[PDB]
């Protein structure tokens, strides 16, 4: 999607469209559907997903929560090059992005088009609150000297 | 497009319900035996005789193949064809203007005699006006129940072949379409052009072809001539069909169509006929041998009842 | 086997085996649908709906070319009226009597012989012009063109949507400024001069 951006979104977080969640997290409604006990069938779980419930948002909600998502453009020119933030449910047809970093990105808003991978597994929730989430790394691994200036 | 189908589809359903041991094993046990129809499982004897006992009795696979029943595509497996019919009706809607009773009625049982006229069952089921006209147009808005899978994007069109066209009240190839190549074509559009000089569709079927007759006109060899119109379709302005026009006979007779009109109108005759339900194969034989085309009525009756034909089973 | 034959007399074969292939829209497609064509190959008998075009642009042809005659017709009808005013004037019954009055007698020899054998004459040809143009385009709007030897027909549906703009944006000025919308702004929030217009 398109990147927009915003003076809100600490750090680490990024604006994420809501009909674009739905459907990335849809298995995750599928399983906190058929487990918090309104369900009947797997078919008729779906039936309430197209029917979009105003009770399937405060599903999905709790589904996001602590669970971030990566970010990727196509070209990546070194490590910081992607990042993991935490979504949070904005309306509109484009993504939001933290201000305070145009550097290890590059590229400025002319409309470019991004990229957003979501890693599910275990220790994939780990493994992305750790060694990447923007927060981790404030300095360039081929320099030391502070990124993320404000300008 | 691509994409999964039959009992990959199903079973890939089969294992999203959780099953424990048994019900996985009977419920693969189950799949296999799913067709293009959906609804025939075939003798439930095989697949309780295929577990090869060790308990597992019958009321315990009944309720599986229940639970197999119940799947995305309404009515499946099951037996009769009148048992996948109740869960059409039990899963449609569940609030129905007395559909639902009468539907039970009507599927239950006497469904066999309801179905080419009501008359009389009219009375047997009490139902009057446009209530019962409603419930048969419901019966007749359900449903094979099944096949909704093959997803058949696209057809595979023949392309033609070679074509002809028609001049001054006569027909002549032309082997339009699209040195070595240019003459090899030009030989097959050739003979092609005077077999379609020869043969003329004309009025009423086709005149009698003789793979002699093509094979004596440029000398060409019959296996060769006939060889190439078996694969390839010649498309003419009108029908598909060109190896029909190829093998035929010498209808043993002097006053005398070929199989080709011997079938054809052979069924063509038989179309018009029966007025209750004559069902005369050997009325048709001598209707067949008053036009001259020597008929011994054994090759008639035989012949003329095949290829979809209802005889001699229409009595 | 029976069963097939059965379920042939239940629904009436319901087309049986013959396949479900439609022309279904994709998703992500909305809209009314602008027009309906459906061009047919000749000798298809076509009939259903694809008819009501041809009368609807034969309607449109016939009002196209009616209003050309009906104006040179009124300057036939004109010349007429200003040659019958030079004798035998008989005013509103001439005007009470339309369609040449019966040629309104011969009047004078000359006025016969000349008068009647140019308004018939001329009216004559007019008419079948109008009925010689009217034929040719009825055979130009009834016909076909050259098509695939595998194609029996094709139809053609036209669709529209009314897209209105959204934080996507990416709107462009002519001084080569790019940019994108931040956010839908409120009118009472945003910036005002001293007489209360809004930005």
């Known amino acids: 999607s398109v990147i927009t951006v915003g003076p809100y979104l600490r750090l680490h977080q990024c604006g994420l469209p809501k009909k674009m969640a739905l459907e990335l997290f849809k298995p995750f409604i599928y399983g906190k559907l058929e487990l918090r006990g309104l369900a009947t069938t797997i078919k008729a779980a779906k039936k309430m997903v197209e029917r979009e419930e105003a009770v399937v948002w405060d599903i999905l909600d709790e589904v996001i929560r602590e669970h971030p998502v990566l970010l990727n453009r196509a070209p990546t020119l070194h490590r910081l090059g992607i990042q993991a933030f935490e979504p949070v449910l904005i309306e509109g047809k484009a993504i ?43 300095l360039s691994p081929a320099n030391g000297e502070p990124i993320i200036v404000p300008s | 497009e691509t994409t999964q189908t039959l009992q990959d589809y199903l079973m890939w359903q089969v294992e999203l319900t959780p099953f424990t041991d048994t019900d996985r094993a009977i419920a693969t046990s189950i799949v296999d035996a799913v067709d293009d129809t959906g609804y025939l499982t075939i003798q439930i004897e095989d697949i309780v005789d295929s577990i090869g006992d060790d308990e597992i009795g019958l009321e315990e696979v009944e309720a599986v193949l229940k639970r197999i029943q119940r799947f995305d595509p309404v009515g499946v497996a099951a037996k009769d064809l009148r048992d996948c019919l109740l869960i059409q009706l039990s899963q449609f809607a569940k609030e129905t203007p007395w559909l639902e009773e009468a539907r039970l009625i009507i599927s239950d049982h006497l469904d066999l005699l309801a179905n080419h006229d009501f008359r009389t069952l009219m009375r047997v089921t009490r139902l009057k006006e446009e209530v019962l006209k409603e419930a048969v147009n419901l019966i007749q808005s359900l449903d094979x129940x099944x096949x909704x899978x093959x997803x058949x994007x696209x057809x595979x069109x023949x392309x033609x072949x070679x074509x002809x066209x028609x001049x001054x009240x006569x027909x002549x190839x032309x082997x339009x379409x699209x040195s070595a190549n240019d003459t090899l074509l030009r030989v097959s559009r050739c003979i092609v052009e005077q077999q379609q000089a020869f043969f003329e569709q004309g009025e009423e079927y086709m005149k009698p072809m003789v793979l002699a007759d093509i094979a004596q006109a440029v000398e060409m060899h019959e296996s060769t001539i006939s060889r190439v119109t078996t694969q390839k379709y010649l498309h003419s302005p009108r029908g598909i069909x060109x190896x029909x026009x190829x093998x035929x006979x010498x209808x043993x007779x002097x006053x005398x169509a070929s199989s080709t009109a011997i079938r054809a109108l052979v069924k063509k005759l038989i179309a018009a006929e029966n007025p209750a339900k004559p069902l005369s194969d050997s009325k048709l034989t001598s209707m067949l041998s008053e036009q001259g085309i020597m008929v011994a009525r054994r090759t008639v009756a035989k012949y003329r009842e095949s290829l979809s034909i209802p005889p001699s089973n229409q009595r | ?188 929030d945003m910036p005002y001069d001293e007489n209360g217009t809004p930005v």
């Open chain 1, 96 to 138: 939001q992005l933290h201000p305070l970093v145009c550097a290890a990105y590059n590229a400025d808003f002319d409309g470019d088009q991004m990229a957003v991978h979501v890693p599910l597994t275990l220790e994939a929730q780990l493994e992305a609150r750790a060694l990447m989430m923007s927060t981790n790394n404030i």
């Open chain 3, 1 to 188: 086997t029976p069963e097939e034959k059965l379920l042939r007399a239940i629904f009436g074969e319901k087309a049986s085996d013959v396949k479900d292939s439609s022309l279904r829209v994709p998703n992500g497609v909305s809209g009314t649908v602008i027009d309906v064509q459906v061009f047919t190959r000749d000798g298809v008998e076509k009939d259903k709906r694809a008819l009501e075009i041809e009368e609807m642009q034969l309607k449109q042809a016939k009002k196209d070319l009616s209003e050309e005659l009906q104006i040179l017709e009124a300057g036939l009808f004109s010349r007429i009226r200003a040659v019958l005013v030079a004798g035998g004037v008989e005013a509103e019954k001439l005007d009470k009597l339309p369609r040449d009055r019966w040629l309104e007698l011969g009047l004078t020899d000359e006025e016969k012989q000349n008068q009647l054998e140019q308004l018939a004459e001329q009216y004559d040809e007019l008419k079948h012009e109008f009925e010689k143009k009217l034929e040719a385009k009825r055979r130009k709007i009834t016909q076909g063109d050259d098509l695939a030897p595998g194609v029996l027909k094709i139809v053609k549906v036209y669709l529209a949507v009314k897209r209105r703009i959204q934080p996507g944006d990416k709107m462009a000025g002519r001084h080569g400024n790019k940019g994108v919308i931040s956010k839908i702004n409120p009118i009472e």
